[PDB]
Design a binder for this molecule. Structure first.
Ligand SMILES: CC1=C(N)C(=O)c2c(COC(N)=O)c3n(c2C1=O)C[C@H](N)[C@@H]3O
Ligand SMILES: CC1=C(N)C(=O)c2c(COC(N)=O)c3n(c2C1=O)C[C@H](N)[C@@H]3O
Lengths: 128, 128
């Protein structure tokens, strides 16, 4: 078997797409009306989003979680200043800043925001 | 920016690695002792796991969620019978089967298991 796709459950497709569009993700046209949307990553792994309605049609037991994230999506920037700047742009836009940029022990400038559903999105670049 | 990595928070690295090894993922040697492990996917996107201890060193607010998944990892199989068989192998091994194989409305044989931490893992193949 091969990992082909990572999927995220969204309360509101259009609101989630606004966020991922801003992150730079290539979002299919008209995705705001879709029950399921896919973005294509290098190598052809897919990032997909499904509405809650969609999920409950085959997985009615689904309920949102509460509390911390089990997962994160990490976006790489071409330099460390770009991390700080994008963090600032996202907070401005009203997105939740979770952890302001810092120099991480593992050698990257790092910062953490949340998507509209509260999913963890990491911003990073390698340290000089 | 580019999506570079997807990260999962694990309570027990060795137990999570046993699971992902069984799914076919190429796991670095000695990963059971690591605070952070990465697997490489086509195109060079990384799948990473971090221990809870690791996460709390910079994100002490982290707590596990409760209830449903916000995310899933989807593995593709070369044919639909392989879905049923792998589902069975995983349940045998003691992993939680969440939804037994079915023919999904979107045109795939599909099944859902949970990893040791309760994360959702999809098994699928396209329908003839
Ligand atoms: C409308 C629709 C699709 N057109 C689709 O392709 C798909 C996939 C594809 O999944 C895979 N793995 O390729 C999955 N869902 C869907 C879905 O609802 C809902 C599921 N969450 C599932 O992931
Ligand atoms: C020990 C260790 C690393 N060697 C490492 O490389 C890394 C990354 C790399 O992340 C990126 N994006 O490349 C991230 N963490 C770590 C970490 O703890 C902990 C974080 N959760 C973070 O994701």
């Amino acid at each position: 078997a091969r990992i082909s796709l990572f999927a995220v459950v969204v309360e509101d497709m259009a609101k989630s797409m606004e966020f991922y569009r801003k992150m730079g993700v290539e979002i299919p046209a008209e995705a705001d009306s879709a029950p399921h949307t896919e973005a294509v990553l290098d190598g052809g792994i897919r990032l997909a989003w499904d509405t809650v309605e969609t999920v409950r049609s085959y997985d009615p037991e689904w309920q949102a979680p509460t509390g911390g994230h089990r997962f994160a999506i990490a976006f790489e920037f071409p330099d460390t200043a770009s991390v700080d700047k994008k963090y600032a742009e996202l907070v401005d836009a009203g997105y939740e800043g979770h952890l302001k940029p810092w120099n991480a022990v593992w050698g990257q400038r790092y910062a953490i925001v949340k998507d509209p559903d509260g999913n963890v999105v990491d911003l990073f670049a390698p340290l000089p």
